[PDB]
Every structure is written in structure tokens, then in C-alpha cells.
Design a binder for this molecule. Sequence first.
Ligand SMILES: O[C@H]1CCC[C@@H]1Nc1ncnc2[nH]ccc12
Ligand SMILES: [Cl-]
Length: 167
Amino acid sequence: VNSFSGYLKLTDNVYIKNADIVEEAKKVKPTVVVNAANVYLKHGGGVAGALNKATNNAMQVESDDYIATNGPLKVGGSCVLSGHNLAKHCLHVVGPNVNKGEDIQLLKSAYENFNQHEVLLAPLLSAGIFGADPIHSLRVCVDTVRTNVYLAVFDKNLYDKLVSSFL
Ligand SMILES: O[C@H]1CCC[C@@H]1Nc1ncnc2[nH]ccc12
Ligand SMILES: [Cl-]
């Protein structure tokens, strides 16, 4: 039993809700919140900009030190950093950005990072301003993640579309 509330159950391990991931994180304080990161951990917009804003830019400060030490992530890769005031940990995961020409096949690799954590609050990778089809992202999530994932979908219209079209 966990404290996630109001989710629709899609499969044995995947749950979905129309919610602002920032407000959800502040309520649940999950062990792991997933960020929709880029390889530079430059948290400018979308989920990343919103999460970082909610940390008062502490996420960005921590991320800049991470990059200065380690260099950029790989597309499809991840790193674990602090969750600041939102969660114990933030798993920064880089899905391919279609608006940069990146290989959509890398979306499965991106979701594989979730399997290193027993429970996660997460967005749909590569959706939104990353330019992929969210229906496809949900399908890859369900077919790749085996741990317990609670998906927050900001856009109510998209949420309803994702539920109604889910196979
Ligand atoms: O699932 C994500 C992945 C792409 C579209 C969805 N959008 C959001 N859902 C919830 N909170 C959010 N805060 C900022 C953006 C956002
Ligand atoms: Cl977005």
C-alpha cells in the first residue's frame, strides 16, 4: 500500500492520473520523482522547468555541478540526484527529443531506467515539448517498465484521450 490517490489502473504495475506532477510530488513526497531531462540537465521548460521552479532553482544549481563533474548524459540515460522539497530523489531521464531529430527507438532505453526503482512518480517520456506521440509513449511505458509507475498527465484533454485509446 502506498499514498498515491485517484489513479486509474492500466496494468498490474502502471497507473495514470490527470495531474500536475509538481503538485502531486508536493502532496505525496514520493521516494522518486522522474524528471523529463535533457543531456545537459538544463531545466528550462516543460516538466523540467516546472520541477526546477518548484525547487527555487536548487535543482538547476545541483545539476550544473553534476554536469561540470561528469559531462552530459546520454539520450536514453539517466542520473539520480536530490528530490529537494519534492521527493527523496529525482531520477533525471533523457527521452529522445523529436524536435532535435533523436531516434524514437531510444524511448524504450529511457524507460528501462525506471526498472531500477521499485516505485516512481513520472511523466510520459518524450511527450509534450519533446515532440513524440504520447499514445506511443504510454505504450512503450507499459511494455517496458516492470516496477510500479504512477504517471501524471498534465493536460486533461490528453489524459482522457490516453485512457480512451488505451489497449
Ligand atoms: O506527463 C507529462 C509528459 C509530457 C506531457 C505531460 N505534462 C505534464 N503533466 C503533469 N505536470 C506537468 N507539469 C509540467 C508539465 C506537465
Ligand atoms: Cl511538456
